[PDB]
Amino acid sequence: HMAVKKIAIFGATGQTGLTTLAQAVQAGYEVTVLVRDSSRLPSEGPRPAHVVVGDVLQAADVDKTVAGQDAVIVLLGTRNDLSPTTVMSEGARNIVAAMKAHGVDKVVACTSAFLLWDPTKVPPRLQAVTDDHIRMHKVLRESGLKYVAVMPPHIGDQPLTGAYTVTLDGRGPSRVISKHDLGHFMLRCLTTDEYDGHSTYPSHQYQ
């Protein structure tokens, strides 16, 4: 009885992706992942239904990942690397093109709460990555797709609670979200239209 049942996850091998993947498999989703050839999912962990090996910078690989899905979750990032980059914005351009070509409308994509900050207050060391989040958000906003812009504060290692605050179109009352709660929220956004076209800032106080 799953209206959304087939999903693509971009970034499933990452910090938030791994727990999003685990929670999605447990919840009954049929998950397709795009993984880079050198970086597959861990063998002991939950297995998705379909694996595409390739790169988000290749339209052909993104097309193969998006075809036949109900919705797309985007958890791309650069791990610890703070260098100038366009992997997230160019990846988003490819995702948008594939979604349009394949009739997929719902995209839930993670950038960061700095897109809700006074821009001159972003820490300089994070500005190069933030610049690409800004480029990525513009690509997704201008696409016309049903886009949920997830803009989290610091991502931590605290528990899954399902009890976090979701602040619409502004910064929320806490400065952290656990990676498990962030993935839980990305999946929650598949089951409702209420956040489409909005920015969302999930946050919580772990106690």
Ligand X SMILES: NC(=O)c1ccc[n+]([C@@H]2O[C@H](COP(=O)([O-])OP(=O)(O)OC[C@H]3O[C@@H](n4cnc5c(N)ncnc54)[C@H](OP(=O)(O)O)[C@@H]3O)[C@@H](O)[C@H]2O)c1
Ligand Y SMILES: Cc1nc(-c2ccc(OCC(C)C)c(C#N)c2)sc1C(=O)O
Q: Catalytic residue positions?
A: 110, 189
Q: Which does 171 bind (CB under 5 to 8 A by kind): ligand X, a copy of itself, ligand Y, none?
A: ligand Y
Q: Is 119 in the site for a copy of itself (CB under 8 A)?
A: yes
CA angle at 30 for the pair 132 and 148, rounded to the nearest 5°: 35
| Of the residues 1, 79, 121, 125, which one makes contact with ligand X according to CB under 6 A | 79
Nearer to a copy of itself, 36 or 138 (CB): 138
Which of positions 8-47 make contact with ligand X (CB under 6 A)?
11-17, 34, 36-37, 39-40
Q: Which does 17 bind (CB under 5 to 8 A by kind): ligand X, a copy of itself, ligand Y, none?
A: ligand X
Q: Is 1 in the site for a copy of itself (CB under 8 A)?
A: no
The per-residue DSSP string of 35-54 comes to E-TT-PPPTTS---SEEEES
Q: Is 158 in the site for a copy of itself (CB under 8 A)?
A: no
| Of the residues 7, 66, 72, 75, which one makes contact with ligand X according to CB under 6 A | 75
CA angle at 198 for the pair 193 and 200, rounded to the nearest 5°: 100
**Which part of the chain contacts a copy of itself (CB under 8 A), choosing from 20-28, 33-41, 81-89, 185-193?**
81-89
What is the distance between the alpha carbons of residues 90 and 57, in angstroms, rounded to a whole number?
A: 7
| Tokens coding 202 | 């999930």
Q: Is 196 annotated as a binding residue?
A: no
CA angle at 172 for the pair 156 and 109, rounded to the nearest 5°: 65
Strand 165-168 and strand 199-203: the pairing is: antiparallel
| Of the residues 52, 94, 145, 152, which one makes contact with ligand X according to CB under 6 A | 152
Query: Which residues, in sequence order, are CB contacts of 18 under 8 Å at separation 6+?
Result: 12, 41, 42, 45
What is the distance between the alpha carbons of residues 197 and 166, in angstroms, rounded to a whole number?
A: 15
Q: Which residue numbers belong to the known binding site for NADP(+)?
A: 11, 13-16, 36, 39-40, 55-56, 76-77, 79, 88, 110, 133, 154-155
